[PDB]
Amino acid sequence: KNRAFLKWAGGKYPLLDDIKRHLPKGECLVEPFVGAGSVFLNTDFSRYILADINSDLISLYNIVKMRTDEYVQAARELFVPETNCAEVYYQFREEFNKSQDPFRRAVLFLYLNRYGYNGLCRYNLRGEFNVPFGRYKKPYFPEAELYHFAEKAQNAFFYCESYADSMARADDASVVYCDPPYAPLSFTLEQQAHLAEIAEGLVERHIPVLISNHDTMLTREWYQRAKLHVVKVKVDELLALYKP
Template sequence: MKDKKNRAFLKWAGGKYKLIEDLKAKLPDGNKLIEPFVGAGSVFLNTQYPRYLLNDINPDLINLYNIVKKQADNYVRDSIELFTAVNNAEQRYYEIRQEFNQTNDLYERAVFFLYLNRHGYNGLCRYNNSGKFNVPFGRYKAPYYPEKEIHFFAEKSQQAIFTCTSFERVFAKARQGAIIYCDPPYAPISKTAMFNSYAKGGFTLDNQIKLADLAKRASETRNIPVLVSNHDTEFTRDIYQGADITKLQVSRFISQNGNKRLKVAELLALYSKK
């Protein structure tokens, strides 16, 4: 019988819920799991390390996690109030989105963030060049309020420290005995996608190369195993040379109406001293 998997309380593009078994099979034992790109936290929620260092470059995400860790009951009480039929309307969504973009109150932002995540299109998290959240309304019949998932996350997060910094700084914090799992923004599948995705900042190809180099050096010079997930392309195969590569086929939505799926080739690259 398979262990019951725990779902994240946020919807998240590229979340690792469906790959948990593959990831757990490759993750070594250690006294701490470090995630420089924690996202929705599916790996954190479905592994059993004594301690966790969980990082993301998105300050709204890390602020939300720290609030849930410290005051889950208050957070549930306040955020569930937004999950009503009245608020599940296009005009109301855009009003709340505007409130989120205008407030600097960290608790308010955390409450609005969950509403936007569950009511926005495809659970996307996207900001414009001015730093304003700009995901359109999702048009769902009755967005799910993840109360059980929030409480589970809060309980498990007592083992975790959440930070909001660069992946380079997170690597620098790692000590022997720790394991690092990296789920960076994926490298583009094609040269066309590469241009569209990387023309304006974001996680560049140079960032991909730097991450691969840090992973290799952490393993070779500091004896810290590193597991990286990414698209399986000529580019990623090249930059992960020397790692133990596992090939995966993962279902992805490929159309806006969400009913067309395509098997996409992904890989896991494990850097570990034999």
């Protein structure tokens, strides 16, 4: 059970067990929607292509991979409890939105993930990071998980681009896994259907794919050519396998 250094108070590491059963095997894993990394951190492919639209995330991750120690040392400073209050939370948020420094930004970013309302990552229309304070007991600085990430990252490349572009990188030796933002009970319905159409194209070329989403009509409509598996846990959750 390997933890992500970033919180997703989605709390979405239970699926992992069913994800791993259903996920085929291969040399490379492409993740067009990497987010916090849990699939990557709990699998053993020999390489990884890891992609996301969020350039803060990708920048952060290149920095953890290539500037490990300087980063880890710099970031821990920010976990002393002088910083566990609103006034300095709001102080850091502003610095972040003002900053032009990739490194300092990555550093503060981890703070806002951890002291932030629900570990949410959101932006306003103006592009400013938008989430408020979370008033959590005492946040844990994820030192161990940082080093794990960085070690495992030596077999990964990270890109900042949209699912369609990362999905074109896949090859006969690849396997794609997709965790798009969830279906209804910003990421449009036409994009959700475009993702399935791209997955259909990749089986025709012998490249396996597996997608996660909620269980709904919409979801079953888009994934109609996949083997479906329903997963229990708070409505159910679907996993759509496209196998050759």
